Design a protein around this ligand. Structure first.
Ligand SMILES: Nc1ncnc2c1ncn2[C@@H]1O[C@H](CSCC[C@H](N)C(=O)O)[C@@H](O)[C@H]1O
Length: 327
DNA sequence: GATAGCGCTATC
DNA sequence: TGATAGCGCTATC
């Protein structure tokens, strides 16, 4: 994550829904905001959240009374994506894990925060011909908020990961917020290699399969993209090896394959999957963040989390706009 | 719970 | 296309 001298969000309170690892909390708190409520129903996510914020989030949101939620100025929510990801069945709102957005909508109608900050995967924008993103837009417009939606790629904001995500920013209409903008991309000066751990600490992640077929020459120079060097098995998800010299592929929560959830990488002549800590780095988490003791649970948590750095630039810009009020 | 083979969709 | 990539799916122990 990035350092922030000017706390655009000082004095503002926020709710952390679908909290997971608390990526949103890290982002807003770095901007001066104050978390007043958090919600995450996964037992393991809860322990990590606690292991890092002292509190345990509240359970199943679909059964929490909105009227119970503390007053807040900014609602944060990176809701479920299984029902919309390019990697899933795309059942959308027909999938039980796909209606969570309306739970948010219910919270907003009740608490009417000054801003609504949401996040989800890229395929969300075009899912079902774009009708899902429209329901969200209208639903928010109908709640009387503006709808700023855009897809950003992490690799464009200082993080070496080809993770493309859609960010939806909504300001309550009564506030004439009209200068909001998404962060301008900037050249990438960091790559996978720069965030790796010493060999001695990842020796155990090294894999060596007879079906390892190297199909491409390691690259000399650093590029701001993913470069496939080889493959294992049929080359399906988690069986593709990339160059640490380029940027990392999109971490996942339920992914399988020998290099499950992180993908394979070529380091000093060896093929291995990323270490939980490296995933953290790949996601923008500060090394001072304590990861869950279960490596599998830890990869899953980072897998469906968010890139702190990106969140920061958006949060800082959210503050900027909210703060511009000339006479 | 942890592990890992997969198989289809979206993109240009 | 044809090649690449995806906060995924789910069977098995
Ligand atoms: N009914 C429900 N109540 C609370 N959390 C729920 C939920 N259904 C799904 N979730 C949670 O939705 C989260 C989506 S992933 C969001 C990750 C988060 N922004 C981060 O930075 O870590 C998951 O952690 C999942 O456990």
């Amino acid at each position: 994550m990035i350092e922030i001298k000017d706390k655009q969000l000082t004095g503002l309170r926020f709710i952390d829904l679908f909290a997971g690892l608390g990526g949103f909390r890290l982002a807003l708190e770095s901007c001066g905001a104050e978390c007043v409520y958090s919600n995450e129903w996964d037992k393991y996510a809860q322990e990590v959240y606690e292991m890092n914020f002292g509190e345990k989030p509240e359970g199943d949101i679909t059964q929490v009374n909105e009227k119970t939620i503390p007053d807040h100025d900014i609602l944060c929510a990176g809701f479920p994506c299984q029902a919309f990801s390019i990697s899933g069945k795309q059942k959308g709102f027909e999938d039980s894990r796909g209606t969570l957005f309306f739970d948010i909508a219910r919270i907003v109608r009740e608490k009417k925060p000054k801003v609504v900050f949401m996040q989800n995967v890229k395929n969300f924008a075009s899912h079902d011909n774009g009708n899902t993103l429209e329901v969200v837009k209208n639903t928010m417009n109908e709640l009387d908020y503006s709808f700023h939606a855009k897809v950003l790629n992490a690799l464009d904001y200082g993080i070496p990961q080809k993770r493309e995500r859609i960010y939806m920013i909504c300001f309550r209409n009564d506030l004439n917020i009209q200068n909001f903008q998404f962060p301008k991309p900037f050249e990438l000066n960091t790559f996978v290699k720069d965030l790796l751990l010493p060999d001695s600490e990842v020796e155990h992640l090294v894999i060596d399969r007879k079906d390892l077929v190297m199909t491409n020459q390691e690259i000399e120079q650093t590029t701001p993209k993913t470069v496939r060097l080889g493959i294992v098995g049929k080359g399906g998800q988690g069986e593709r090896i990339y160059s640490t010299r380029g940027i990392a592929i999109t971490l996942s929560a339920y992914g399988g394959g020998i290099f499950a959830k992180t993908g394979g990488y070529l380091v000093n002549g060896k093929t291995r999957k990323l270490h939980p800590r490296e995933c953290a780095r790949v996601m923008g988490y500060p090394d001072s963040y304590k990861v869950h003791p279960s490596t599998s649970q830890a990869y899953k948590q980072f897998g469906n989390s968010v890139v702190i750095n990106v969140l920061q630039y958006i949060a800082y810009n959210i503050g900027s706009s909210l703060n511009f009020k000339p006479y």
